[PDB]
Amino acid sequence: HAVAQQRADRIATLLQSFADGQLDTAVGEAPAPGYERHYDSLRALQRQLREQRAELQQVESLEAGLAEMSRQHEAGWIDQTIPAERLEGRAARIAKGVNELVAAHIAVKMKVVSVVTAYGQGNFEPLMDRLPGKKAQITEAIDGVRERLR
Amino acid sequence: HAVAQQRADRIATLLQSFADGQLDTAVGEAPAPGYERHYDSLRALQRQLREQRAELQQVESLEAGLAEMSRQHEAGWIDQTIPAERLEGRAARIAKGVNELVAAHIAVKMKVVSVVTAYGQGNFEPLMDRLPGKKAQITEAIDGVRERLR
Ligand SMILES: [Cl-]
Ligand SMILES: [Cl-]
Ligand SMILES: [Mg+2]
Ligand SMILES: [Mg+2]
Ligand code: NA
Ligand code: NA
């Protein structure tokens, strides 16, 4: 009678904690045989709430990292990247993905600058890369510059 | 005796479902007064598991969208963007953030191409934007091209 209520209150308290976002309490083992199923599920649920909390926090950090990277680049510090090494899982892969895509565009941009700077110096040895898709328009444009400049 | 066990099994089953990822069952209301706390928490937990599931799915979609955008740009279709409008919350903001940052770099790149293309035609009216930070190196480079070309 007394124990039954106590064990019931314990389960209510643990569930209440989960609901309120208090995931630090250690669930532990069941008090008696008839509560094994309840506790098995409670422990499993807790592990899941903790994992999802961590993953969602990583995403929040990813948004802040992107925000700072954007701020840095608008200020001209284009070497700045999102510190993917400080993230993990999917958040880290997305961060690396953004860094690589931005880096790829910067590389094409600097290639253009490098080639035309040379033409400006009378050095016509360099040729713009042969780009695909819409980027092919850049290749033709720069070739046109070369032909006309000399 | 019979009812007690039945109501206890119901709570075990609901918790078991949550654990296994079956969040579609409708919890409903408590069967008797002494179970109000349990059910209140169960409903709240379910709402949270569903919300976190949705948010994590959005992130998975964000990673795929970035992957496809990267694939498209490497192929030269640089007008392609991550469809942020099809996402929501933080996932959507990150997507828009990536689209804007990439677009900003492309704009600087095309500005460079536009200016030098003009110089190649003997049209020295356009001047490269005055860029900050490390980007200032691009401004000086292109100015140098202008001065030397004419
Ligand atoms: Cl720096
Ligand atoms: Cl297209
Ligand atoms: Mg010269
Ligand atoms: Mg000319
Ligand atoms: Na990617
Ligand atoms: Na941003």
Numbering used by the authors:
A (entry chain A), B (entry chain A): 7 to 156
From the paper:
Aer2 is a soluble receptor that contains three N-terminal HAMP domains, a gas-sensing, heme-containing PAS domain, two additional HAMP domains, and an MCP KCM. The three N-terminal HAMP domains of Aer2 (named HAMP1, HAMP2, and HAMP3 from N- to C-terminus) provide examples of two distinctly different conformations: HAMP1 and HAMP3 are similar to the Af1503 NMR structure, whereas HAMP2 has a comparatively distorted four-helix bundle structure in which the AS2 helices approximate a two-helix coiled coil and the AS1 helices splay outward at the C-terminal end.
The His44 side chain redirected from the bundle core towards AS1. This caused a tilt in the AS1 helix and a 5 Å shift at the top of AS1, resulting in a loss of secondary structure at the AS1 N-terminus. Despite these adjustments in AS1, the AS2 output helices superimposed with those of the native HAMP1 structure. In other words, the mutation did not alter the position of the HAMP1 AS2 helices, which must transmit the CW downstream signal. In the L44H structure, the tilt of AS1 drives the helices apart, disrupting upstream helical packing and resulting in a loss of observed secondary structure at the N-terminus of AS1. Because the L44H variant is strongly CW biasing, and the H1 conformation generates CW output, we assume that the structure seen at the C-terminal domain in the crystal is maintained in the Tar fusions.
